[PDB]
Design a binder for this molecule. Structure first.
Ligand SMILES: NC(=O)c1ccc[n+]([C@@H]2O[C@H](COP(=O)([O-])OP(=O)(O)OC[C@H]3O[C@@H](n4cnc5c(N)ncnc54)[C@H](O)[C@@H]3O)[C@@H](O)[C@H]2O)c1
Ligand SMILES: [Cl-]
Ligand SMILES: [Cl-]
Ligand SMILES: [Cl-]
Ligand SMILES: [Cl-]
Ligand SMILES: [Cl-]
Ligand SMILES: [Cl-]
Length: 324
């Protein structure tokens, strides 16, 4: 029963970092790729004895992938669009894993392609991952796909798009977005809950989870309910305002702009589900989107805890002063 070695990429990202911290603490050795060794998170992870970092780009660097998977038995792969070529990278990684011959369970962090379920456009930073998921499914090794809910800690009072908990002149907070005020959205405390859930999937094993899609969300809340949780947590007035166009108050990469534009159409105009797949939609009991995740990890944290216990600290660390 010796803890198996786990290979991961984008180690400094919230999903991977969450898994690495808890995995290492319970005995797993981790082989982790990082784009660069500098930075608070990379430095923190390098200081963990059970962790070995491998710095370099994923883009057109299969050699790094072969190195990463050498001696690994488990994998948790979450890519990004940063370098472009996310589909090619996700496929290269999967091929490298299969090539290693030792990967018993490959978990890929996937997202939906909304254009497959309704008269909706594909959200650009999500649809590509589904393509990688389809490719991975065809490979001869067990694989499981996790779909991340919206991160509680996307929220900030800095003028960043879509998830700004704006501090008003009078001390009150307002969150403006295209999401319908009352339709429940899936949320996730990435930092605390992704790691433990992923570890449980690995503990459960490939026979139980091969071919499965798991919604990594532990609570659903409408925008109005999110604001009410921040209000209870902070003892301040927090209200939601639905706006057709995302308020883009800072310069952003074009790819992100296109992501936001698709979101205005999908959620603003169409009010489509965040998880549009059929399976995520006397005595008879239908499965709720949060069922599997909660069964995987019972110690999950809600939005109210985030708002009251973590948000003030993240905000202070970002230089904000409202909590002073
Ligand atoms: N924020 C959410 O609510 C949410 C929900 C579902 C899915 N996702 C998906 O999560 C993915 C990101 O994963 P994450 O949340 O674990 O990470 P992250 O957003 O926490 O950070 C990514 C890290 O990767 C580094 N990085 C990645 N590619 C790089 C490159 N080519 N050059 C330099 N640095 C690079 C960045 O500096 C950064 O520190 C995205 O593809 C997104 O679509 C996010
Ligand atoms: Cl193990
Ligand atoms: Cl990284
Ligand atoms: Cl870095
Ligand atoms: Cl180390
Ligand atoms: Cl398969
Ligand atoms: Cl700017």
């Amino acid at each position: 029963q010796q803890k198996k070695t786990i290979a991961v990429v984008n180690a400094t990202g919230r999903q991977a970092a969450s898994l690495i911290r808890v995995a290492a603490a319970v005995g797993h050795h981790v082989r982790a790729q990082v784009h660069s060794l500098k930075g608070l998170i990379a430095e923190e992870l390098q200081a963990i004895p059970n962790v070995t970092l491998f710095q370099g780009p994923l883009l057109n660097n299969v050699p790094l992938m072969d190195t990463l998977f050498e001696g690994a038995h488990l994998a948790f792969i979450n890519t990004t669009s940063q370098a472009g070529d996310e589909i090619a990278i996700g496929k290269d990684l999967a091929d490298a894993a299969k090539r290693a011959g030792t990967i018993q369970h490959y978990i890929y962090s996937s997202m939906p392609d909304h254009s497959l379920y309704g008269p909706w456009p594909a959200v650009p930073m999500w649809a590509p991952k589904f393509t990688v998921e389809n490719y991975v499914r065809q490979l001869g090794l067990p694989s499981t796909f996790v779909y991340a809910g919206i991160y509680n800690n996307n929220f900030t009072s800095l003028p960043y798009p879509l998830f700004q908990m704006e501090l008003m002149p009078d001390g009150t907070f307002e969150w403006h977005a295209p999401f319908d005020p009352d339709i429940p959205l899936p949320w996730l405390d990435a930092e605390h809950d992704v790691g433990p859930a992923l570890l449980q999937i690995f503990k459960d094993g490939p026979q139980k989870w091969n071919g499965h899609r798991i919604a990594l969300t532990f609570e659903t809340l409408s925008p109005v309910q999110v604001c009410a949780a921040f209000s209870r947590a902070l003892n301040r007035r927090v209200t939601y305002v639905q706006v057709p166009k995302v308020e883009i108050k800072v310069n952003i990469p074009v790819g992100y702009r296109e992501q936001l534009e698709a979101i205005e159409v999908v959620f603003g105009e169409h009010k489509a589900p965040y998880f549009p797949l059929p399976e995520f939609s006397g005595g008879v009991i239908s499965q709720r989107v949060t069922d599997e995740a909660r069964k995987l990890w019972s110690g999950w944290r809600d939005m109210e805890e985030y708002a009251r216990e973590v948000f003030p600290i993240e905000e202070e660390a970002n230089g904000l002063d409202w909590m002073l």
